[PDB]
Chains A and B, each alone.
Chain A
Amino acid sequence: NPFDDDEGVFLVLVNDEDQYSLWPEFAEVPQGWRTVFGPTSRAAALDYINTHWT
């Protein structure tokens, strides 16, 4: 699964309700979501989400 792939390259997305989503960079960003971080490693993206989704 791309969301569990430690060899992946990742973005962090947020919606208008301030919820966050990990995202593989190869995939198109869905409507209603905007990129706030990345491209970056999986661990750094999760670090960002744990930092900002507060």
Chain B
Amino acid sequence: NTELYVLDSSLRPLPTGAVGELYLGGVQLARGYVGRPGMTASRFVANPFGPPGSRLYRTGDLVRRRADGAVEYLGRV
């Protein structure tokens, strides 16, 4: 169950029409095995918005939110 976030470089949510980076919430990865811990820790980061201990998927993609709340894709950073 994924939530879409549009954040600035300070990890703050952005208003309608502002250009930011897409982060995905509700992410779950395998718990038993982490073969690439550093890359994982840089790609799936602590979530300031979800439940305690949750993580955000840092997509590295540029997006902006429309008036109806939907997300428009603008290309990879």
Residues of A within 8 A of B (CB): 1-4, 12-13, 15-17, 19-24, 26-33, 46-47, 49-50, 53-54
Residues of B within 8 A of A (CB): 9-11, 21, 31, 34, 37-38, 40-42, 44-48, 51-55, 58, 60, 77
| Contact between B77 and A49, CB atoms less than 8 A apart | no
| Contact between A30 and B46, CB atoms less than 8 A apart | yes
A31 to chain B, nearest CB (A): 4
Cβ–Cβ < 8 Å partners of B46 in chain A: 13, 15, 21, 23, 29-30, 33
User: Which of A1, A16, A26, A54 contacts B53 (CB under 8 A)?
Assistant: A16
Cβ–Cβ < 8 Å partners of B44 in chain A: 21
